[PDB]
RNA sequence: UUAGGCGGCCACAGCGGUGGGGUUGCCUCCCGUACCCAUCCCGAACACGGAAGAUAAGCCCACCAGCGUUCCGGGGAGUACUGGAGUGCGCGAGCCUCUGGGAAACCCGGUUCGCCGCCACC
RNA sequence: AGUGCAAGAGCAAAAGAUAGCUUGACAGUGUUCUUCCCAACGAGGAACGCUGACGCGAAAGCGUGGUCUAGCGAACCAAUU
RNA sequence: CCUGUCAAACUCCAAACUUACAGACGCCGUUUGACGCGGGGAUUCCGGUGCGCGGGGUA
């Protein structure tokens, strides 16, 4: 990479297809999850807050408590265990 | 509409019915919404919760089913609103609902407005709702005193036939009084 | 059908596009109500670089205030045709514009469930000339 | 149910491929295993397709091989009818064979090594550089095709 | 310089002028020849088909095109036929003209990427294929071996 | 749902167009400014009060595919591309066979002029 | 279009415009990610909390500076609270 | 309307493939103790080649 900022190489993953453009529906930004629930991490291009480091887009973690309204999701990066602070807006129930 | 790249607003935004930015700030509380709505002739008051396939209404009250308790006056005024609020408030209570936030939809937060009236009523029904006392009307206007005095400048009945000639904010009291004990559907 | 289709006057805007006023005075008297400042956009060579800046006034008259004005304004005008909107409007003159439309217009101006007026229910140039012409004067 | 026979060595072959052959209980060139035709098992043999020889053997052939190259989960013990009978649910080799082909049981379930360590093909095989459709000996085979190889390596 | 230096399609597609500057002008004079006032309303249609994907410098294009049309004056300056070269030199080409240090070359020209089997030239004639000869001469000045294919023309 | 309120999915719902519908449950336009409230100027809007009138807008109902969209059939196409293998071919660029996957454009013909949830309601 | 500045991205009853008001560009202390994928490493950065005190709003709520990714600096010593 | 072409820093589309998590089979572990945790000792931080994909370069 020519630079090493967080958004380096995120032109594709952090951009919406033209039709999904514009404010996202509030239903999923308010979803409630329970500890132990498996959730997929996927940043919503339209939702600025509650994000996580793009590197983790695509991970399926395990909700384990929350911090403020944001949730704390455990994931494993390669072989390393990590806790990710993310809001519902960027989460989806597995299955 | 124009092409593949075109962006169509969500349905309730095309219809100019739902303000989605506000809806989100509303759902934040995690509490049930006290949906205050109006019509030229009527005034609605619903207590909505969030659901898997859309909102769920646990309790409602419409200015029309007000007469079902002895209302013999118009149904698009302040006294009407308040009561409809108190009516929904009570039903709400019956449903096991204890608190809610005021959703006034696409209306304006004007002081002494009917939505705040709906809110005053709902609160008096025993429902806990974040509010601000001095943004509400001064009880008398809620009774419908502003209208009685307006008919004082008579010369011609404010009410075409309807009931009374000088109107009755008392009829308001008699009704509130009624709703505060027993009766069916409450 | 009719009655709820027959034209009516909705606001008559009388504005003086000056370039920097003392003019408000005459608009107030000519109409019957206070005028409104007219700020301008974009910086330009006519020493009009100031974004926010009084550069004329206007007055939106409705109901009787609008008729009682046109009942003298119109008389001071001759023109017609070509000089008419595609929506049935027309401006003459100091400017004096007249917005014309039919009964269910509040549908496109209100906040809730607002909507744009269907082309069929819109007012045509012709249908406009008729209404006004049929009110103290002659077309073309 | 297909008969798998590794025909190409391990040197240079992708590891993820080699590991699969290993999960299918084959660890040496010329070793054969019997695998059920499942979605899961299909995927594995397809991945191994270029270093193996497979197909469905005829009852008799399986029997010949079983008789000639089957082994207890441990030891020299020759697997003959008597062995089969005194040790398995079946009464003889044919009883076992039939069960294998009909995918009702496995060499393990009967206390037999999942691997038929065959002998080099008498007369040699058709080459390990081309598939069957090309005159080689790699890939899926005819029941007649598989039998020939299996028999030659009996 | 030789075609050897640019005839292969091994480098990335390099054509974004918004990022490349100092690109030489194309030597290709025209793309439509003959009676371009008329539309392909001719009985016979022969084409020149390249048989290998290659890069053809605007140099060769012009030299190949000239050689063919210049010959199509076996039909006369205002003869009845139309000749088209359908390819355009979009691929910008460089040259590293310091040894291998900072070697990204500088723009020196352009070429057209033609895939084996595409038709680079298309002529339209009335049963008067002198055009077949105009092409034995055109594929004489381009890298690939070529196929002279006749399409609408069962008049053999 | 003989017209409502809040929504979910967020064009299959968009754009354009035709037909139908209201002494009332109704929604509207509509009528009107003493009040609460309101316009940097206008009761236009917002807010409040109300029914003389109307179904012409909106809205609800039924329908049209011309455009945009969704999905499907047949063709393009098992083509393009591609994971695995090859003492197959080719001066080479590159190609071919075996195995496992498999497109886009475009054309023709269907589909689509929203679906679903809660509440209230001759 | 606009959103201070590269580029890429976000945004329309707004994240833009106008008006008004306000000083959360607040003190204290953390969780987590990043810096340094995996996988140890400081400063710096960010996301998200809590305690305290406040601003605005009818209220839900929003404000841990600017819509997001650049705008930065150890020990010793000095000055300062 | 018709007609002729393109894109590493274009995208109305769009694979093969890579990848998070889970189930199933396989394989492995429970005297051969896997997975994991803690500690002692390193060596190492001139690499090269084939193939696939590359970027630069006439090569
Ligand atoms: Cl993170
Ligand atoms: Cl409302
Ligand atoms: Mg990319
Ligand atoms: Mg043994
Ligand atoms: Mg021999
Ligand atoms: Mg041989
Ligand atoms: Mg109608
Ligand atoms: Mg911010
Ligand atoms: Mg020092
Ligand atoms: Mg990759
Ligand atoms: Na969105
Ligand atoms: Na140098
Ligand atoms: Na040649
Ligand atoms: Na001003
Ligand atoms: Na109507
Ligand atoms: Na740090």
From Swiss-Prot, chain A:
Please verify whether the record's keywords include Iron.
no
Q: Which BP terms from GO are recorded?
A: translation
Q: Which PROSITE patterns match?
A: RIBOSOMAL_L21E (PS01171)
| InterPro entries, per database record | Ribosomal_eL21 (IPR001147), Ribosomal_eL21_arc (IPR022856), Ribosomal_eL21_CS (IPR018259), Ribosomal_eL21_sf (IPR036948), Translation_prot_SH3-like_sf (IPR008991)
Instruction: Give one GO molecular function term.
Output: structural constituent of ribosome
Q: Where is this region: Disordered?
A: 1-65
Summarize subunit and interaction data from the UniProt record for this chain. Part of the 50S ribosomal subunit. Interacts with protein L18 and binds the 5S rRNA. Has been cross-linked to L18.
Main role? This is one of 5 proteins that mediate the attachment of the 5S rRNA onto the large ribosomal subunit, stabilizing the orientation of adjacent RNA domains.
Protein name, please?
Large ribosomal subunit protein eL21
The gene that this protein is the product of is rpl21e
UniProtKB/Swiss-Prot annotation, chain B:
Q: Does the keyword Secreted apply?
A: no
What GO CC annotations are associated with the protein? cytosolic large ribosomal subunit
Q: Which GO terms are recorded in the biological process aspect for this UniProt protein? A: ribosomal large subunit assembly; translation
GO MF entries? 5S rRNA binding; structural constituent of ribosome
Output the superkingdom of the source species.
Answer: Archaea
Please indicate if the UniProt record lists RNA-binding as a keyword.
Answer: yes
**Pfam families with a match to the protein in the record:** Ribosomal_L5e
Q: Which UniProt keywords apply?
A: Ribonucleoprotein, Ribosomal protein, RNA-binding, rRNA-binding
Record family assignment: Belongs to the universal ribosomal protein uL18 family.
State the oligomer form and interacting partners: Part of the 50S ribosomal subunit. Interacts with proteins L5 and L21e, and attaches the 5S rRNA to the 23S rRNA. Has been cross-linked to L21e.
> What does the UniProt function comment say about this protein?
This is one of 5 proteins that mediate the attachment of the 5S rRNA onto the large ribosomal subunit, where it forms part of the central protuberance and stabilizes the orientation of adjacent RNA domains.
Q: What is this protein called?
A: Large ribosomal subunit protein uL18
Q: Which gene encodes it?
A: rpl18
From Swiss-Prot, chain C:
* Role, per record: This is 1 of 5 proteins that mediates the attachment of the 5S rRNA onto the large ribosomal subunit, stabilizing the orientation of adjacent RNA domains. Forms part of the central protuberance. Modeling places the A and P site tRNAs in close proximity to this protein; the 5S rRNA and some of its associated proteins might help stabilize positioning of ribosome-bound tRNAs. In the 70S ribosome it is thought to contact protein S13 of the 30S subunit (bridge B1b), connecting the 2 subunits; this bridge is implicated in subunit movement.
Looking at the keywords, is ATP-binding present? no
Name the record gives this protein: Large ribosomal subunit protein uL5
- Provide a GO biological process annotation: translation
Name a GO CC annotation attached to this entry: ribosome
Q: Which domain of life is it from?
A: Archaea
May I ask which residue range the UniProt record assigns to the signal sequence?
A: none
Stored HAMAP family: Ribosomal_uL5_A (MF_01333_A)
Q: Which key words are in the record?
A: Ribonucleoprotein, Ribosomal protein, RNA-binding, rRNA-binding, tRNA-binding
Q: Which family does it belong to?
A: Belongs to the universal ribosomal protein uL5 family.
Subunit composition and interactions: Part of the 50S ribosomal subunit. Interacts with protein L18 and the 5S rRNA, and probably with tRNAs. Forms a bridge to the 30S subunit in the 70S ribosome.
Which source organism? Haloarcula marismortui (strain ATCC 43049 / DSM 3752 / JCM 8966 / VKM B-1809) (Halobacterium marismortui)
Q: Name one GO molecular function term.
A: structural constituent of ribosome
Q: Which InterPro entries match?
A: Ribosomal_uL5, Ribosomal_uL5_arc, Ribosomal_uL5_C, Ribosomal_uL5_CS, Ribosomal_uL5_dom_sf, Ribosomal_uL5_N
Which Pfam families does the UniProt record give?
Ribosomal_L5 (PF00281), Ribosomal_L5_C (PF00673)
Curated annotation (Swiss-Prot), chain D:
Alphabetical GO biological process terms:
maturation of LSU-rRNA from tricistronic rRNA transcript (SSU-rRNA, 5.8S rRNA, LSU-rRNA); translation
Query: Which residues does the annotated region (Disordered) include?
Result: 114-146
Q: Which UniProt keywords apply?
A: Ribonucleoprotein, Ribosomal protein, RNA-binding, rRNA-binding
Query: What InterPro entries does the annotation carry?
Result: Ribo_uL30_ferredoxin-like_sf, Ribosomal_uL30, Ribosomal_uL30_arc, Ribosomal_uL30_CS, Ribosomal_uL30_euk_arc, Ribosomal_uL30_ferredoxin-like
The answer, when asked if Plastid is one of the entry's keywords, is no
**GO function term, MF aspect, one:** rRNA binding
Question: Sorted alphabetically, which HAMAP family does this protein's record hold?
Answer: Ribosomal_uL30_A (MF_01371_A)
What protein am I looking at?
Large ribosomal subunit protein uL30
Gene source species: Haloarcula marismortui (strain ATCC 43049 / DSM 3752 / JCM 8966 / VKM B-1809)
């Amino acid at each position: 990479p020519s630079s090493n900022g967080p958004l380096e190489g995120t032109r594709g993953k952090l951009k919406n297809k033209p039709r999904d453009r514009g404010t996202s529906p509030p239903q999923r930004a308010v979803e409630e999850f329970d500890d132990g629930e498996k959730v997929h991490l996927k940043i919503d291009p339209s939702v600025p807050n509650g994000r996580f480091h793009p590197r983790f887009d695509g991970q399926t973690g395990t909700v384990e408590g929350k911090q403020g309204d944001a949730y704390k999701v455990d994931i494993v990066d390669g072989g390393k265990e990590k806790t990710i602070i993310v809001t519902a807006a960027h989460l989806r129930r597995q299955e | 509409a124009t092409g593949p790249r075109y962006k169509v607003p969500m349905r309730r935004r095309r219809e100019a019915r739902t303000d989605y930015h506000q809806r989100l700030r509303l759902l934040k509380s995690g509490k049930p919404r006290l949906v205050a709505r109006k019509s030229n002739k009527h005034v609605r008051a619903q207590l909505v919760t969030l659901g898997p396939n859309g909102d769920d209404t646990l309790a409602s009250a419409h200015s029309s089913d007000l007469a079902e308790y002895g209302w013999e006056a118009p149904t698009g005024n302040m006294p009407s609103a308040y009561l409809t609020g108190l009516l929904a408030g009570l039903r709400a209570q019956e449903a096991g609902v204890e608190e809610a936030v005021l959703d006034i939809g696409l209306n304006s937060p004007t002081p002494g407005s009917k939505v705040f009236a709906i809110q005053e009523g709902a609160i008096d029904a025993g429902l806990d709702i974040p509010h601000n006392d001095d943004v509400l009307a001064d009880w008398q206007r809620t009774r419908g005193a502003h209208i009685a005095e307006y008919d004082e400048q008579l010369e011609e009945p404010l009410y075409s036939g309807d009931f009374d000639a000088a109107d009755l904010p008392e009829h308001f009291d008699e009704l509130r009084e009624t709703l505060l004990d027993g009766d069916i559907e409450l | 059908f009719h009655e709820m289709r027959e034209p009516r006057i909705e606001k008559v805007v009388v504005h003086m596009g000056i370039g920097h006023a003392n003019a408000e005075d005459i608009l107030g008297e000519i109409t019957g109500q206070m005028p409104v400042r007219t700020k301008a956009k974009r910086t330009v060579g006519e020493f009009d670089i100031r974004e926010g800046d009084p550069i004329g006034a206007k007055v939106t008259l409705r109901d009787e205030m609008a008729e009682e004005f046109l009942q003298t304004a119109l008389p001071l005008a001759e023109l017609a045709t070509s000089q008419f909107d595609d929506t049935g409007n027309f401006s003459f003159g100091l400017d004096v514009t007249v917005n014309l439309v039919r009964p269910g217009y509040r549908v496109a101006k209100r906040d809730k469930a607002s909507r744009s007026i269907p082309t069929k229910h819109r007012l045509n140039p012709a249908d406009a000339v008729a209404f006004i012409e049929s009110t103290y004067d002659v077309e073309v | 149910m297909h008969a798998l026979v590794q025909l190409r060595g391990e040197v240079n072959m992708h590891t993820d491929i080699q590991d699969t052959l290993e999960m299918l209980n084959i660890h040496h060139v010329n070793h054969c295993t019997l695998v059920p035709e499942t979605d899961a098992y299909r995927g594995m043999v397809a991945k191994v397709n270029d270093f193996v020889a497979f197909g469905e053997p005829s009852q008799e052939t399986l029997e010949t091989v079983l008789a000639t190259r089957a082994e207890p989960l441990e030891g020299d013990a020759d697997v003959d009818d008597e062995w089969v009978a005194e040790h398995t649910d079946y009464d003889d080799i044919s009883g076992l064979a039939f069960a294998l082909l009909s995918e009702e049981t496995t060499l393990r379930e009967q206390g037999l090594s999942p691997t038929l360590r065959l002998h080099p093909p008498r007369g040699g095989h058709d080459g390990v550089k081309h598939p069957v459709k090309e005159g080689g000996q790699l890939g899926k085979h005819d029941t007649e095709g598989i039998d020939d190889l299996l028999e030659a390596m009996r | 310089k030789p075609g050897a230096m640019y005839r292969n399609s091994s480098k990335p597609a390099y054509t974004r002028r918004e990022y490349i500057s100092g690109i030489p002008g194309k030597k290709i004079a025209q793309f439509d020849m003959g009676n371009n006032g008329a539309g392909p309303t001719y009985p016979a249609q022969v084409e020149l088909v390249v048989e290998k994907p290659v890069q053809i410098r605007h140099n060769a294009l012009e030299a190949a095109r000239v050689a063919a049309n210049r010959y199509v004056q076996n039909s006369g300056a205002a003869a009845n036929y139309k000749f088209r070269i359908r390819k355009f030199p979009f691929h910008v080409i460089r040259e590293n003209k310091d040894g291998m240090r900072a070697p990204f070359g500088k723009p020196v020209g352009t070429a057209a990427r033609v895939h084996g089997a595409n038709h680079i030239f298309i002529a339209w004639v009335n049963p008067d294929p002198n055009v077949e000869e105009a092409w034995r001469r055109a594929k004489m000045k381009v890298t690939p071996t070529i196929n002279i294919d006749s399409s609408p023309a069962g008049n053999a």
